[PDB]
C-alpha cells in the first residue's frame, strides 16, 4: 500500500510506482527510476544481502 495504510484506508499500488513517488518526493524525477529500474533493483538486492 505504501503510506496509505497509516493515514486511512489501504490503497493498492505497484511497488515501482511507490518508489517513483518516493523519488519524486525528494526532488528526483521519476524517469531515472522508470528507466534504470534493473540497476536500482540489483543495488537494493545487494544491500539486503
Amino acid at each position: 500500500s505504501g503510506w496509505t495504510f497509516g493515514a486511512g484506508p489501504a490503497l493498492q499500488i505497484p511497488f515501482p510506482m511507490q518508489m517513483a513517488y518516493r523519488f519524486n518526493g525528494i526532488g528526483v524525477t521519476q524517469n531515472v527510476l522508470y528507466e534504470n529500474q534493473k540497476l536500482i533493483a540489483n543495488q537494493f538486492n545487494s544491500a539486503i544481502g
Binding site: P16, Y34, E35, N36, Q37
Partner: peptide, 19 residues
Amino acid sequence: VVIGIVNNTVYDPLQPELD
C-alpha cells in the same frame, strides 16, 4: 527501456488551433 508501458496517444494544445 521502460518496462510495462502501453501504446496510447496524447493530445496537443497547439495542433488544432494551428490547423
